[PDB]
Amino acid sequence: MSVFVSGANGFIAQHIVDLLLKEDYKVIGSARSQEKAENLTEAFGNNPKFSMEVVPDISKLDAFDHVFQKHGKDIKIVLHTASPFCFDITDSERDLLIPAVNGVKGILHSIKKYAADSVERVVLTSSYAAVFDMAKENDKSLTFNEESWNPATWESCQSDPVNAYCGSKKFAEKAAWEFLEENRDSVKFELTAVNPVYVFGPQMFDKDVKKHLNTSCELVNSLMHLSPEDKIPELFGGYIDVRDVAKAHLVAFQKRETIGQRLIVSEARFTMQDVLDILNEDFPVLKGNIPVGKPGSGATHNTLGATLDNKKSKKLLGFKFRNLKETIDDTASQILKFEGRI
Amino acid sequence: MSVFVSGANGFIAQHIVDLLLKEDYKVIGSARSQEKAENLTEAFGNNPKFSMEVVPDISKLDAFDHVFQKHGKDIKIVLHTASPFCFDITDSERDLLIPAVNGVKGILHSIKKYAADSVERVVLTSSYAAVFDMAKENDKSLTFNEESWNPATWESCQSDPVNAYCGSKKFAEKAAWEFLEENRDSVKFELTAVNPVYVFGPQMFDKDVKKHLNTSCELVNSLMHLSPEDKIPELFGGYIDVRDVAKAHLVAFQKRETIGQRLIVSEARFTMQDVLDILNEDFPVLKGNIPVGKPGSGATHNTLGATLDNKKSKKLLGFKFRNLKETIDDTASQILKFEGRI
């Protein structure tokens, strides 16, 4: 009853390890170096049921061979949360697209060779970037669901860095499904994809906040630090708390009904205005020091773009998600506690 | 006199090498790998006036020690065009900001250590990203010039990946001027920064087009492959032809008047509509197959944002720049001829 979590030091991944250990699973994780592996096992307080392997570069196809060669008979569940450790914008194909695809193909081929009969479930951390149409998010008449796929092609997505990045998520998820479709009679596992939107919420450990804020929580951090007259960035998307994302990964491998499914983990829509309203209303230390904008004109009070219909995902997952106030509260409070501002 | 060109296989740098050889300089370049080094020397016809050294990682502070130790007495000009390879958007400080700064400090420390009395001129390839205020580029009432610096701070630029990247360019260039200020008595060299906008134009060699289009020319390529009913991306900026950027690097070290200067190399403003108009007007093979948009509504006919005042740079450089028609024509024609469409 052992579970392998790749890139276990990640924002989402640390919460996954946390939940797994609280549910009395044995957990094996990967990090890019011995130091990082040690830091994490120490952070969890040398739990006997938690062990780490070192996997320095997941962009290589043989990266996960040793772990499955050494522990393959013992691993029942694989939660592949790790993404290629770095990328660049020139030669998108060689430096972003190909590594993204191999980053998924490698671990699956490791399973096929050293654990074709023991691994029962694989959950892939995907993204809403593999689902949506970036140019059509603002179209109120449209609806996107679990069956929606990013329309960008291998060639067309290379237009600019942002499109290329979202394209890499599509082709990464596609390679997973393709591997299983073709190797179904050669592997025992079933596959599920978890597709988060913008991920907010507290870091698993308080020390992390200084270095390890993800892209979404960085947006909150910057808002907290803007002057009263500073401009408000224009952003629209779904939001989800990191703990709900972590919980969804467990439900993804635990339930029969999540087999072969893409699960969009999103609670509702937001804009930066919605985040600003919460910051102002909930944090006396910030009130008067940050921008105010136009209170109550964000997506928590209005329909501002395409409908994200993840009712299937919600039904399948079977647990209620944290709202924006709660996730921003926890995110902001943790940063303010790290800054000693209380 | 022997001119050192870091990252000599880059889009701009290949043109710099071409120009230098034509003016009968001896050239030493660097590339991240032996393969790339050998590919470049081959492409230039195994010209014995041109040699290549391997420098895998420019952010390691001893990166360039070997080249300047063995060639320091001979190297009189340094054209630092290389930027860190790879980046990451979660830990922007560790994976983007610090490497950018060290990618500049390293080579300058190498020069101080091994070529303090011989290197006479250093030219840094910086960027208009170090000059502009991204949020104010919109505002017609505002002007940016050679004395303008990106207002983003080390903390504030970390708000998002685009801002972080732009911030990294600021801090890289800042480190260069600071190094010279603090070491003026211990080094001989004078410093010049070249700061390009969006760089369009033909690759030095035709075979490259398949893999090696930079971010800006990738925009042109993507426009050439849109259907008549596709929507056009919304983008505003300055433009410059790659050959003019390359020439400017030579002028930047050849002239006395460019000592201690930041030179913004930009001809005029553009939007994607201006690019579309050129593609439709000059290429029968594209017209009727790509969007038309709203012809003549672009930045070549209208004022659509802040004024880029580089009159000082243009005067100091002393040569006229190619216009948008010219640079897009050459970009598209090379792609079309590579696609056998002519």
Swiss-Prot record, chains A, B:
InterPro entries named in the record: 3Beta_OHSteriod_DH/Estase (IPR002225), NAD(P)-bd_dom_sf (IPR036291), NAD(P)_dehydrat-like (IPR050425)
Processing and modification events after translation: The N-terminus is blocked.
Cellular component, GO annotation: cytoplasm; nucleus
Temperature behavior of the protein's activity: Optimum temperature is 40 degrees Celsius for 3-chloro-1-phenyl-1-propanol reduction, and 54 degrees Celsius for 2,5-hexanedione reduction, and 30 degrees Celsius for the reverse reaction.
Gene Ontology biological process: ergosterol metabolic process; filamentous growth; steroid biosynthetic process
Alphabetized SUPFAM superfamilies for the sequence: NAD(P)-binding Rossmann-fold domains (SSF51735)
Gene Ontology molecular-function annotations: 3-methylbutanal reductase (NADPH) activity; 3-methylbutanal reductase [NAD(P)H] activity; methylglyoxal reductase (NADPH) activity; oxidoreductase activity, acting on the CH-OH group of donors, NAD or NADP as acceptor
Reported pH dependence: Optimum pH is 7 for 2,5-hexanedione reduction, and 10 for the reverse reaction.
Catalytic activity, reaction form: (S)-lactaldehyde + NADP(+) = methylglyoxal + NADPH + H(+); 3-methylbutanol + NADP(+) = 3-methylbutanal + NADPH + H(+); 2,5-hexanedione + 2 NADPH + 2 H(+) = (2S,5S)-hexanediol + 2 NADP(+); (S)-3-chloro-1-phenyl-1-propanol + NADP(+) = 3-chloro-1-phenyl-1-propanone + NADPH + H(+)
Active site (catalytic residues): 169
Entry's induction text: Repressed by SKO1. During osmotic stress, this repression is relieved. Induced by transcription factor YAP1 during oxidative stress, and induced by ionic and heat stress. Induced by isoamylalcohol.
Annotated knockout phenotype: Causes hyperfilamentation, probably due to the elevated levels of 3-methylbutanal in the mutant.
Annotated positions of the Phosphoserine modification: 333
Compartments, as annotated in UniProt: Cytoplasm; Nucleus
Binding positions (NADP(+)): 7-12, 32, 36, 57-58, 165, 169, 199, 216
Record has rRNA-binding as a keyword: no
Superkingdom per UniProt: Eukaryota
Activity regulation summary: Activated by glutathione.
Pfam families registered for this protein in UniProt: 3Beta_HSD
E.C. code: 1.1.1.283, 1.1.1.265
CDD domains per the UniProt record, alphabetical: AR_SDR_e (cd05227)
Use in biotechnology or industry: Used as a biocatalyst, because the enzyme accepts a broad range of substrates including aliphatic and aromatic ketones, chloroketones, diketones as well as beta-ketoesters which are reduced with high stereoselectivity.
Subunit structure: Monomer.
Miscellaneous remark of the record: Present with 5458 molecules/cell in log phase SD medium.
Family: Belongs to the NAD(P)-dependent epimerase/dehydratase family. Dihydroflavonol-4-reductase subfamily.
Protein name (Swiss-Prot/TrEMBL): NADPH-dependent methylglyoxal reductase GRE2
Organism: Saccharomyces cerevisiae (strain ATCC 204508 / S288c) (Baker's yeast)
Gene assigned in the entry: GRE2
